[PDB]
């Protein structure tokens, strides 16, 4: 799919071109989810290991909520880029090959005559 | 194992898939497959129980002949194109061989007989490696060659696997074999979308790995190879009962959990490509897989099976804990669905 | 350590040599005045034919004739 | 107490300091990345 | 905990082993004054003398070590064993199955001490010798045939993994004299036990336990008179040559795995809880849930060792 | 906020909820006042029709 | 390929010898060295779907 | 706050959803075209490195 | 002759058909040792002295010999008379002729013409296999390293299996 | 292969002979394949016993093939309506019934009729609506 | 060559049919398995030789080196089997059912 694109960075995570895109707001609901996803991992661990669920490993709880979140910003930063490349790529083609994607005129309903099936 | 040997083997079992993935000269891809075959056989017979020798001798013969067939495809290509690698021009039969062969190493469809049996005689641990770090290698070879393979065969092996996996699983009561059967099924979905959108194969795999790896480390936490054995989970370790429940329903496609995404996007991609015949039948028997998953749910969680008196003794003693990976791979798996858009 | 080699030279007087020449051969090439020539005496042999380049007048070194003073002259291999 | 003492009774103080300290390095790199990022984004584009 | 890291970096059992380091069990009839010999031999070579496995031996083993309530410890009574043989509820089989689990824990704890500290082990009766009680119980009406099969299946599944006793001692006193020994010790439950049942216990040892182990380990038979003379018996042990037996092949890289097993009690008895549903063994879900949901609420047991504040654990918020 | 930290959980959800539902508006504010039926011209000293 | 650890690392352990026109020992060109060149300098920058 | 807010909010919701819908369909058409055409950055399958050929003086005439 | 290779090729198929009828473990080893001899010869036909002899040196006496060796140690229980197999084998000997025959009438063909040694430098040296196999040490030094690990970790794989 | 395809080329309900012949072959082919898997796995006791099973499966399958072909063609003939899933359903209905008989079970005939017929009907619809099976990737 | 290349290929298929149709002894199979490696080695060497593609001769041998160990593993499994059953018949390998 998107691989084989000109300029593809053969093994890079997020090419610098992704600098142009806005950075993910740290409180983006998603990163906040990853946070909660993380807290739960932590709590779950405590549970499976039979420790006071919430009052234990308060250091770990932090490692978790802060590892998942850290991961998020840098992942979302990329997935965001990938999607952004997709448009660059998609929109460009629509133009470079214009005839294939022609603008269409939609007749005002006045003109079009969709048939009327009566419910009766 | 003299720790040195452990290192050499483990390195090979790990250099095996990695060479396959990194190289482009098919030959070097073949030897990557060859190493994996050589490295896995020692670990398979670690207990050296009579069942084990049977396992390895089957795994080895099935793996070896497939390896030879893959080499024949490379040898034939070399004469139809001087290149040592499949190209647009490749004779169709040349590629189909590679599909069958690689579908034997991965154990898909009508070649699904070896896997359930080797998964039954190997330890739970080596079971995981045999199921998930040995599927990465062959799949890599296929994913690389996707543009050229046949849409018809893949689909047939895909559908067959789904059915065989499901039907096989319904009867099985041994856990190792229930998982072997599930893997056949999931492996099927993966190979269904390969011709159309390889990138989704790599999602339907990771999710399978992030689902199966927690599931097996669960089976071994109590080292239960029987459902009856996993059913007394409530006494041996009560907390894992909650997540074991969700992970197994996640392995099947039920909608709130992460497991729906692989099936959902594979169905979306197949309908985008118009296989609304094939996709429909697959999704339907996919529902058979959940039936045997939920039957296990019943025994392990929703209903409490009776336990032996000595179970009280095992409770007393501190239970060696499950590694952290269980949690991080249980949650990222049971509930990431709210984050699907970025996964795909 | 040094007197452990003395019985290992009296008894076991084989592996000593095999790990004394295994290595000696790794240090003789790195420390010899003449190891440079092996990749050079082996680089001079014209097994295939030397294709001549077209003249432009922009090439002073290229020896025009086999006997010009110019070019790869090996008065080295001689009396190496 | 316990006849067989726990292995975890007094905290593994290393595990605290690499767990706490690691997380505080994560943030200081993460928050840094964001503001740094925001800038790169602003200058690379109009503002 | 012990791991390949530790094994890779020193910590090898081989370098911790010495002549006095062996697994020595002393087995006898219900009353062989065995206890004394063991503690005596123990005193001789500093051997850690493990006491005979008990109903609450596991509870003394785990956590606080205070004796557990009977139902928490599997509801087994040796006392009821005797007063009500061939009981409807089968307390006798449940007693035997818990006893096998207790010695499995004791033998494994013994092996862990042996491979770590290197001090040799004296544990009285062993798992290998436990079968004589069941053989005698099946010989009379105490246990039915399947009950026997269930114990044998657990024995075949778990006992082979552990290495055999280095040597076994046999303090034998005749069927009649143990009953008079029984007659003067005070408990009334030990009294009135079947002479034929005691006949079947010692006969089972002589017929099966001593010959079987006579190759797996150095059996040292001692008559009562040799007994009560720990010095002499101790002398003989120091005299026997620990050669014949499977222990000879235990290289360091082999011991490591055995150590990591005994190091994990939850595995030692993993096959002791196999889901074979014979009626006596079955907890039952409603009773079992209550017993678990009650044992787990005992102070210091709710959470893992080190994390339950009731008994005074602290630092939980950083553990 | 002691022993009452479990009574202010749900209520707080409400506030956060209202904070988002009034934030969603802020996003979907195109056609702020550009709709046909309701396109009045800004009254003096009024920033925007609906906030 | 699937994981291009080779291009990234810049190493070329597996690419130098994939086609008949690759460097042959002692510069002994193989049969067809002429064609394969003409058939791969053609299909360079043009993807397969249009190299076919 | 009023009838004005929901009417204008609903029109904004429809514009985002209408524009998302047109683009999703155009993707499917562009993706059909580049796969078969192979004239666009997506679906550009590889052929061997030109960098690995050898246009150097060989040992025989006529390469 | 010109059918220098075909005939041989035909013999190679005969030996493979013998291994395929799965004759007694060691009677067929001979079969391999026969077709290995045959394959050794064909490669020599094309000028691959080194590559050829190599097979006669490693697969022939190294691999195969060790194979039967083990046969003797085990799986040479030498408990269907191979003669029955020879009977069938004879059938195939000519049954293959049938397969070839259809294409024989259909006809390349008429034995073997210039369907070997397509192009060879009528002048020149260094053109000889073993110069190519020695690229393990120049310009193809990754095949050499991975083969090493095969054999090297082979030692460790075998002993571990044996133990 | 130009053969099997012929079934579709001529309008349905017409040239039943060809239809029945083609349908019978496909069933029979499936019979062979099915028997083969049935003999390779779950082998027989004697060669003859297995030859029989091959025959049994082949004939049963050939039969379901025939009646399907015959019923659908005739149903269309008699009904005069060439394009109608119902024709096929009646055919599939019949086919299942043959299977049921060969297996000597009324119940199987039940599931057989419904399931088999439905499937065949869907084939007709599929052809009528130009549904594509095993499609090439066109993304 | 085109003619011969056929014989070798069918040799590999006849060896294929062999390994996919067992009969008693396993050592037969492993032996057959090897018949393929010889056929592959011969075919790879043959085409490399008539393509004058010397850069590829490394492969004909890498194929053998990997195939030899592959077989080493195969035989150790075989010895392991006639140590646990002592008869090496594919017949008794059915415990896993
Ligand atoms: C509780 C802890 C809260 C901590 C709050 C910390 C402070 C804070 O974050 O406040 C500021 C911060 C400011 O947010 P904002 O960006 O200004 O909000 C405006 C957005 O436009 C408003 O957000 P948006 O709608 O633009 O977000 C985009 C996206 C965001 O996507 C998500 O974040 C999904 C979160 C799902 C939860 O929307 C979606 O949610 C799409 C997915 C909807 C659900 C799809 C899956 C449904 C089936 C599965 C349901 C879940 C099953 C779990 C598995 C089973 C478990 C048993 O608030 C948040 O970001 C968090 C909002 C709540 C997140 C979910 C919490 C649960
Ligand atoms: C989208 C919704 C999906 C479905 C959500 C609701 C179902 C959640 C999954 C439930 C699956 C298991 C069902 C059966 C569980 C049986 C639990 C049990 O038997 O009790 C013991 C167990 C462990 O016990 P322990 O915590 O150690 O202490 C008590 C010892 N007796 O006790 C425990 O396990 C306690 C912890 C249980 C887990 C708590 C989960 C609470 C419910 C989660 C709802 C999430 C809703 C999300 C909604 C999203 C909307 C977008
Ligand atoms: C549609 C696709 C169909 C594909 C073929 C399917 C064939 C039927 C499959 C199931 C057959 C019924 C099960 C029993 C088959 C059987 O027993 O034969 C195995 C065969 C003989 O060897 P053995 O295993 O000892 O069997 C003796 C039995 N008394 O073992 C062998 O034959 C070993 C290999 C030797 C014979 C082949 C050697 C290669 C040359 C073949 C030439 C042509 C042979 C034609 C027959
Ligand atoms: C005018 C009325 C026309 C009705 C047509 C449909 C019913 C025709 C029934 C004919 C007789 C069938 C029969 O008797 O066999 C029942 C069948 C097999 O039953 P079995 O247990 O094998 O014993 C039969 C012993 N002679 O057992 C079966 O599998 C029966 C399957 C067909 C059932 C048909 C009726 C279903 C009604 C569903 C109603 C849903 C609301
Ligand atoms: C989705 C909802 C679908 C609802 C369909 C309802 C149909 C109801 C029909 C009446 C009930 C018939 C029934 O349930 O019988 C079950 C049958 C009982 O067994 P019996 O018929 O004696 O044969 C045993 C063969 N092993 O058990 C069997 O016979 C099972 C084996 C026969 C299967 C027959 C169906 C085959 C379909 C092939 C379709 C190919 C395309
Ligand atoms: N498996 C068993 N079944 C029944 N009773 C057992 C078992 N094992 C040990 N016992 C009990 O142990 C008692 C003997 O212990 P005893 O010799 O009094 O201990 P000590 O060594 O302190 O003297 C017997 O009365 C017997 O009932």
In angstroms, the CA J7 to CA E233 distance is: 97
In angstroms, the CA K4 to CA I43 distance is: 12
In a domain, A26, yes or no: yes
Q: Which residues are bridge partners to E168 per DSSP?
A: E25, E219
CA distances from E276 to A101, B229, E55 (A): 70, 9, 22
In a domain, A116, yes or no: no
Residue A29 domain boundaries: 1-97
Nearest CB partner across the interface for K41, out of I17, I55, I71: I55
Of E225, A105, J4, K56, the closest CA to residue B75 belongs to K56
Number of Cβ within a 10 Å radius of residue F9: 8
Number of Cβ within a 10 Å radius of residue H26: 15
Of B306, B148, B282, the closest CA to residue B228 belongs to B306
Q: Look at I127 and G28 and tell me if their CB atoms are within 8 Å.
A: yes
* Secondary structure in 3-state letters for I131-142: CCHHHHHCCCHH
How far apart, in Å, do the first and last CA atoms of chain G sit?
20
Contact between B219 and B227 under an 8 Å Cβ cutoff? The reply is: no
CA distances from D19 to A65, D15, D27 (A): 12, 6, 13
In angstroms, the CA A69 to CA D29 distance is: 12
Q: Could you tell me the CATH number of the domain that includes residue K13?
A: 1.10.287.3510
Contact between K34 and B42 under an 8 Å Cβ cutoff? The reply is: no
- Chain G touching partners, 3 or more CB pairs below 8 A: A, B, C, H, I, K
- Reported as half-sphere exposure (CB side, CA atoms, 13 A), residue I74 has a value of 17
Q: Find chain H residues with C-beta within 8 A of F25's C-beta.
A: 5, 9
Q: Look at B57 and K77 and tell me if their CB atoms are within 8 Å.
A: yes
In angstroms, the CA I113 to CA E179 distance is: 104
Nearest CB partner across the interface for B147, out of H28, H45, H48: H45
- Reported as half-sphere exposure (CB side, CA atoms, 13 A), residue E291 has a value of 27
In a domain, A4, yes or no: yes
Nearest CB partner across the interface for H54, out of G22, G48, G49: G22
Torsion over CA: B264, B269, B270, B276 (sign): positive
Q: Look at G31 and I119 and tell me if their CB atoms are within 8 Å.
A: yes
The residue contributing the CA closest to ligand 2 atom 25 is B239
In angstroms, the CA G24 to CA I131 distance is: 10
Q: Which residue in E275, E281, E302 has the most chain B C-beta atoms within 10 A of its own C-beta, making it the best mutation to test that interface?
A: E275
In angstroms, the CA B335 to CA B9 distance is: 35
H-only helix segments in chain E? 4-8, 34-45, 57-61, 78-83, 91-116, 127-139, 145-158, 175-184, 195-204, 210-216, 230-239, 252-262, 265-268, 285-295
In angstroms, the CA B215 to CA B247 distance is: 7
Of B202, B78, B94, the closest CA to residue B149 belongs to B94
Given ligand 2 and candidates E288, E296, E298, which is best to mutate, with the most ligand atoms within 8 Å of its CB?
E296
Q: Which residues are bridge partners to E122 per DSSP?
A: E24, E49
DSSP states along F4-50: -TTTSHHHHHHHHHHHHHHHHHHHS-TTSS--STT-PPPPTT---S-
Counting one residue from chain G and one from chain K, the pairs whose CB atoms sit within 8 A come to 23
Q: Find chain E residues with C-beta within 8 A of B228's C-beta.
A: 275
In a domain, A109, yes or no: no
Around ligand 6, the residues with Cβ closer than 6 Å are: E 30-31, 34-35, 52, 78, 81, 95-96, 99, 124, 130, 133, 190
Is the CB–ligand 2 distance for residue B244 below 6 Å?
Answer: no
Tell whether H56 is within 8 A of chain I (Cβ).
no
- The distance of Cα J56 from the centroid of its chain, to the nearest Å, equals 16
Q: Kindly give the distance from the C-alpha atom of residue A37 to the centroid of ligand 1, in angstroms, as a whole number.
A: 11
Q: Which residues are bridge partners to E26 per DSSP?
A: E169
- The dihedrals phi and psi of A28, each to the nearest 5 degrees, come to -50, 135
* Secondary structure in 3-state letters for chain I: CCCCHHHHHHHHHHHHHHHHCCCCHHHHHHHHHHHHHHHHHHHHHCCCHHHHHHHHHHHHHHHHHHHHHHHHHCCCCCCCCHHHHHHHHHHHHHHHHHHHHHHHHHCCCCCCCCCCCCCCCCCCCCCCCCCCHHHHHCCCHHHHHHHHHHHHHHHHHHHHHHC
In angstroms, the CA J5 to CA J8 distance is: 6
Q: Kindly give the distance from the C-alpha atom of residue J34 to the centroid of ligand 3, in angstroms, as a whole number.
A: 17
DSSP states along K61-75: HHHHHHHHHHHHHHH
In angstroms, the CA K40 to CA K62 distance is: 12
Contact between J87 and J94 under an 8 Å Cβ cutoff? The reply is: no
Helix I25-45 to helix I5-20 angle (10° resolution) is: 160
Q: Which residue in I74, I141, I157 has the most chain K C-beta atoms within 10 A of its own C-beta, making it the best mutation to test that interface?
A: I74
Contact between B44 and K80 under an 8 Å Cβ cutoff? The reply is: no
In angstroms, the CA B115 to CA B138 distance is: 15
Which DSSP state fits C68?
Answer: S
Resolution limit in angstroms? Answer: 4.2
In angstroms, the CA A69 to CA A72 distance is: 5
Residue I24, C-beta contacts closer than 8 angstroms, at least 6 positions apart: I78, I82
Q: Are strands E167-172 and E218-223 parallel, antiparallel or unpaired?
A: parallel
Helix, strand, or coil here: B308? Answer: strand
* Secondary structure in 3-state letters for chain A: CCCCCCCCCCCCCCCHHHHCCCCCCCCCHHHHHHHHHHHHHHHHHHHHCCCCCCCCCHHHHHHHHHHHHHHHHHHHHHHHHHHHHHHHHHHHHHHHCCCCCCCCCCCCCCCCCCCCCCCC
Residue B64 sits at the vertex; the CA angle it makes with B62 and B67, to the nearest 5 degrees, is: 110
In a domain, A106, yes or no: no
Torsion of CA C45, C49, C54, C56, to 10 degrees: 10
Is the CB–ligand 3 distance for residue K35 below 6 Å?
Answer: no
DSSP states along B160-227: HHHHHHHHHHHH--BHHHHHHHHHHHHHHHHHHSTTT-HHHHHHHHHHHHHHHHHHHHHHHHTT--BH
Which DSSP state fits E48?
Answer: E
Helix, strand, or coil here: E168? Answer: strand
How many folded domains does chain A comprise? 1
In angstroms, the CA D6 to CA B318 distance is: 10
Of B232, B247, B261, B234, the closest CA to residue B331 belongs to B247
Q: Find chain H residues with C-beta within 8 A of C49's C-beta.
A: 59
Q: Are strands E167-172 and E48-49 parallel, antiparallel or unpaired?
A: unpaired
* Secondary structure in 3-state letters for I72-83: HHCCCCCCCCHH
Nearest CB partner across the interface for J137, out of B195, B277, B278: B195
Q: Find chain J residues with C-beta within 8 A of H32's C-beta.
A: 138-139
Nearest-ligand number for the alpha carbon of E291: 2
CA distances from K59 to B33, B74, B175, F16, K63 (A): 15, 11, 43, 67, 6
- The dihedrals phi and psi of J67, each to the nearest 5 degrees, come to -60, -35
The residue contributing the CA closest to ligand 6 atom 24 is E30
In angstroms, the CA B168 to CA E260 distance is: 37
Q: Find chain K residues with C-beta within 8 A of I25's C-beta.
A: 25, 27-28, 31
Q: Which residue in I22, I70, I80, I143 has the most chain K C-beta atoms within 10 A of its own C-beta, making it the best mutation to test that interface?
A: I22
Q: Find chain C residues with C-beta within 8 A of H57's C-beta.
A: 51
Q: Which residues are bridge partners to E25 per DSSP?
A: E168
Residue J112, C-beta contacts closer than 8 angstroms, at least 6 positions apart: J95, J96, J97, J99, J100
Tell whether A6 is within 8 A of chain H (Cβ).
yes
Number of Cβ within a 10 Å radius of residue B331: 27
Q: Look at I157 and B38 and tell me if their CB atoms are within 8 Å.
A: yes
Torsion of CA E228, E229, E234, E237, to 10 degrees: -80
In angstroms, the CA E154 to CA E135 distance is: 15
Residue B24, C-beta contacts closer than 8 angstroms, at least 6 positions apart: B85, G1, G6, G14, G15, G18
Q: Which residue in J137, J138, J139 has the most chain B C-beta atoms within 10 A of its own C-beta, making it the best mutation to test that interface?
A: J137
Residue B238, C-beta contacts closer than 8 angstroms, at least 6 positions apart: E292
The residue contributing the CA closest to ligand 6 atom 19 is E35
Around ligand 1, the residues with Cβ closer than 6 Å are: A 27, 29-30, 32-33, 36; B 256-257, 335, 337-338; F 20, 23, 27
In angstroms, the CA E228 to CA E273 distance is: 39
Q: Which residues are bridge partners to B226 per DSSP?
A: B174
Torsion over CA: J18, J19, J24, J25 (sign): positive
- The Cα of I87 is separated from the nearest Cα of chain K by a number of Å equal to 17
Contact between C71 and C63 under an 8 Å Cβ cutoff? The reply is: yes
Contact between D34 and A10 under an 8 Å Cβ cutoff? The reply is: no
Contact between A21 and D45 under an 8 Å Cβ cutoff? The reply is: no
- Reported as half-sphere exposure (CB side, CA atoms, 13 A), residue J124 has a value of 25
In angstroms, the CA J139 to CA B270 distance is: 9
Longest dimension (CA), chain F: 54
Torsion over CA: E267, E269, E271, E277 (sign): negative
Residue B129 sits at the vertex; the CA angle it makes with B124 and B135, to the nearest 5 degrees, is: 135
Q: Which residues are bridge partners to E121 per DSSP?
A: E23, E48
In angstroms, the CA B326 to CA A45 distance is: 8
**Experimental approach taken:** cryo-EM
Residue J19, C-beta contacts closer than 8 angstroms, at least 6 positions apart: J7, J10, J12, J69, J70, J72, J73
Tell whether I121 is within 8 A of chain H (Cβ).
yes
Residue B258, C-beta contacts closer than 8 angstroms, at least 6 positions apart: B207, B210, B211, B250, B332, B333, B334, B335, B336, B337
CA distances from C46 to B67, C39, I120, J90, K54 (A): 43, 14, 20, 85, 19
């Amino acid at each position: 799919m998107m691989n084989g694109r000109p300029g593809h960075e053969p093994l890079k995570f997020l090419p610098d071109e992704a600098r142009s895109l806005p950075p993910p707001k740290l409180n983006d609901p998603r990163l906040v989810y990853m946070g909660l996803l993380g807290y739960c991992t932590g709590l779950m661990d405590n549970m499976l290991r039979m420790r006071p669920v919430m009052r234990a490993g308060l250091h770990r709880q932090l490692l978790f909520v802060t590892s998942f979140v850290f991961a998020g910003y840098f992942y979302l930063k990329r997935q965001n880029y990938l999607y952004a490349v997709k448009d660059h790529d998609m929109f460009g083609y629509i133009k470079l090959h214009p005839e294939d994607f022609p603008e269409k005129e939609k007749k005002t309903y006045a003109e079009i005559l969709e048939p009327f099936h009566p419910v009766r | 194992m003299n720790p040195i040997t452990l290192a050499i083997i483990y390195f090979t079992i790990f250099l095996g898939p990695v060479i396959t993935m990194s190289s482009t000269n098919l030959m070097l891809m073949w030897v990557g497959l060859e190493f994996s075959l050589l490295a896995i056989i020692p670990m398979l017979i670690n207990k050296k129980n009579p069942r084990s020798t049977e396992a390895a001798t089957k795994y080895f013969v099935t793996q070896a002949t497939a390896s030879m067939i893959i080499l024949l495809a490379i040898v034939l290509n070399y004469k139809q194109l001087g290149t040592w690698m499949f190209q647009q021009q490749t004779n169709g039969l040349i590629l189909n061989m590679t599909l069958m062969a690689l579908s034997m190493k991965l154990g898909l469809a009508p070649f699904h007989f070896w896997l359930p049996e080797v998964t039954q005689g190997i330890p739970l641990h080596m079971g995981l490696i045999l199921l998930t770090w040995q599927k990465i290698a062959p799949l890599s070879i296929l994913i690389q060659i996707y543009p050229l393979l046949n849409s018809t065969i893949i689909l047939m092996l895909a559908i067959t696997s789904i059915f065989m996996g499901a039907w096989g699983g319904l009867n099985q009561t041994q856990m190792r074999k229930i998982m072997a059967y599930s893997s056949i099924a999931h492996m099927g979905w993966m190979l269904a979308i390969l011709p159309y959108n390889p990138s989704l194969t790599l999602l339907n795999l990771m999710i399978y790995i992030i689902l199966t790896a927690p599931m097996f480390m669960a089976l071994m936490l109590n080292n239960s190879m029987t459902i009856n054995s996993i059913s007394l989970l409530w006494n041996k370790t009560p907390a894992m009962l909650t997540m074991i429940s969700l992970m197994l329903l996640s392995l099947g496609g039920l909608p709130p959990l992460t497991g729906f995404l692989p099936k959902w996007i594979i169905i979306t991609e197949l309908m985008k490509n118009n296989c609304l015949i094939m996709a429909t039948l697959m999704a339907m028997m996919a529902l058979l897989n959940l039936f045997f998953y939920t039957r296990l749910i019943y025994s392990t969680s929703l209903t409490m099976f009776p336990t032996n008196n000595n179970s009280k003794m095992m409770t007393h003693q501190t239970k060696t804990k499950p590694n952290l990976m269980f949690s991080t791979l249980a949650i990222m798996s049971t509930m990431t669905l709210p984050l699907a858009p970025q996964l795909i | 350590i040094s007197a452990f080699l003395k019985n290992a030279w009296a008894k076991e007087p084989v592996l000593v040599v095999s790990f004394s020449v295994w290595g000696l051969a790794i240090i003789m090439p790195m420390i010899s005045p003449y190891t440079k020539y092996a990749s050079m005496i082996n680089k001079a042999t014209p097994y295939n034919y030397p294709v001549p380049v077209r003249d432009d007048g922009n090439m002073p070194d290229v020896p025009s004739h086999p006997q010009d003073p110019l070019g790869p002259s090996l008065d080295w291999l001689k009396n190496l | 107490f316990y006849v067989r003492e726990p292995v975890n009774a007094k905290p593994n103080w290393l595990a605290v300091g690499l767990s706490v300290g690691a997380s505080v390095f994560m943030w200081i790199y993460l928050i840094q990345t964001h503001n740094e990022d925001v800038l790169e984004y602003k200058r690379r584009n109009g503002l | 905990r012990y791991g390949l890291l530790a094994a890779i970096l020193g910590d090898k059992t081989t370098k911790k082993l010495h002549e006095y380091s062996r697994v020595i069990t002393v087995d006898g009839n219900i009353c062989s004054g065995k206890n004394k010999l063991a503690k005596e031999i123990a005193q001789q070579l500093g051997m850690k003398h493990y006491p005979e496995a008990g109903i609450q031996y596991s509870s003394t083993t785990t956590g606080d070590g205070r004796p557990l309530d009977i139902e928490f410890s599997g509801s087994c009574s040796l006392e009821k064993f005797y007063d009500d043989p061939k009981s409807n509820d089968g307390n006798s089989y449940r007693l035997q199955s818990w006893l096998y689990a207790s010695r499995l824990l004791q033998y494994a704890d013994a092996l862990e001490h042996l491979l770590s500290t290197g001090q040799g082990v004296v544990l009285e009766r062993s798992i290998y010798s436990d079968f004589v009680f069941l053989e005698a119980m099946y010989n009379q009406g105490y246990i039915r045939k399947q009950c026997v099969d269930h114990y044998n299946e657990i024995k075949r599944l778990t006992l082979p993994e552990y290495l055999p006793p280095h040597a076994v001692i046999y303090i034998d006193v005749p069927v009649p004299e143990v009953q008079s020994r029984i007659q003067k010790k005070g408990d009334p439950h030990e009294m009135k036990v079947t002479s034929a049942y005691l006949q079947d216990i010692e006969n089972a040892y002589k017929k099966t336990f001593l010959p079987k182990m006579s190759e797996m380990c150095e059996v040292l038979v001692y008559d009562s008179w040799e007994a009560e003379d720990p010095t002499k018996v101790v002398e003989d042990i120091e005299y026997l040559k620990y050669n014949k037996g499977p222990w000879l092949k235990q290289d360091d890289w082999t011991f490591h795995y055995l150590r990591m097993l005994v190091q994990d009690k939850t595995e030692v008895l993993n096959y002791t809880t196999i889901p074979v549903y014979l009626p006596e063994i079955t907890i039952g879900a409603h009773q079992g849930s209550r017993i678990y949901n009650s044992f787990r609420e005992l102070p210091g047991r709710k959470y893992a060792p080190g994390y339950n504040a009731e008994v005074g654990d602290k630092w939980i918020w950083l553990k | 906020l002691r022993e009452h930290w479990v009574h202010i959980l749900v209520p707080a959800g409400f506030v956060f909820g209202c904070y988002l539902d009034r934030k969603d508006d802020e996003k979907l504010t195109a056609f702020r006042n550009k709709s046909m039926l309701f396109q009045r011209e800004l009254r003096p000293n009024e920033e925007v029709t609906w906030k | 390929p699937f994981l291009d650890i080779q291009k990234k690392l810049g190493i070329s352990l597996d690419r130098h010898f994939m086609f008949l026109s690759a460097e042959q020992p002692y510069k002994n060109a193989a049969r067809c060295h002429a064609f394969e060149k003409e058939w791969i300098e053609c299909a360079h920058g043009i993807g397969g779907t249009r190299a076919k | 706050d009023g009838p004005e807010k929901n009417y204008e909010k609903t029109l904004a919701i429809l514009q985002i959803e209408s524009e998302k819908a047109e683009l999703r369909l155009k993707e499917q058409e562009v993706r059909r075209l580049m796969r078969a055409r192979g004239d666009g950055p997506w679906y550009q399958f590889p052929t061997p490195e030109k960098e690995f050929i050898d246009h150097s003086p060989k040992a025989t005439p006529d390469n | 002759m010109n059918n220098y290779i075909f005939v041989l090729s035909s013999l190679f198929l005969v030996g493979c058909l013998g291994l395929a009828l799965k004759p007694s473990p060691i009677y067929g080893g001979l079969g391999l040792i026969v077709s290995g001899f045959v394959g050794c010869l064909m490669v020599l036909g094309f000028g691959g002295s080194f590559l050829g002899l190599m097979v006669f040196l490693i697969y022939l006496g190294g691999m195969l010999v060790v194979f039967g060796y083990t046969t003797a140690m085990a799986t040479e229980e030498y408990p269907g008379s191979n003669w029955l197999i020879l009977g069938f084998l004879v059938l195939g000997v000519i049954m293959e002729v049938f397969l070839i025959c259809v294409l024989n009438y259909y006809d390349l063909g008429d034995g073997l013409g210039d369907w070997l040694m397509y192009e060879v430098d009528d002048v020149g040296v260094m053109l000889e296999g073993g110069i190519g196999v020695a690229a393990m040490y120049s310009c193809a030094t990754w095949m050499m390293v991975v083969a090493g690990w095969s054999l090297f970790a082979g030692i460790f794989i075998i002993i571990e299996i044996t133990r | 292969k130009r053969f099997f395809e012929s079934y579709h080329e001529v309008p349905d309900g017409t040239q039943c002979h060809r239809k029945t012949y083609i349908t019978t072959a496909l069933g029979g082919i499936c019979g062979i394949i099915g028997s083969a898997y049935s003999v390779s796995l779950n082998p027989a006791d004697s060669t003859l016993e297995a030859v029989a099973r091959v025959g049994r499966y082949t004939f049963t399958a050939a039969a379901i093939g025939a009646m399907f072909g015959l019923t659908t063609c005739v149903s269309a003939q008699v009904r005069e309506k060439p394009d109608d899933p119902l024709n096929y359903f009646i055919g599939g209905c019949a086919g299942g019934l043959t299977l049921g008989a060969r297996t000597h079970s009324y119940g199987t005939a039940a599931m057989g009729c419904v399931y088999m017929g439905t499937a065949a009907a869907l084939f007709k619809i599929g052809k009528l609506e130009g549904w594509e099976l095993f499609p090439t990737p066109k993304v | 060559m085109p003619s011969t290349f056929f014989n070798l290929t069918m040799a590999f298929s006849l060896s294929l049919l062999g390994t996919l149709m067992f009969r008693s002894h396993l050592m037969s199979t492993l032996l057959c398995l090897e018949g393929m490696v010889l056929s592959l080695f011969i075919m790879t060497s043959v085409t490399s030789l008539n393509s004058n593609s010397m850069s590829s001769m490394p492969i004909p041998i890498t194929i053998l080196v990997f195939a030899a160990c592959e077989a080493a593993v195969g035989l150790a499994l075989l010895v392991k089997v006639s140590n646990t059953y002592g008869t090496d018949y594919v017949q008794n390998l059915n415990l896993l059912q």
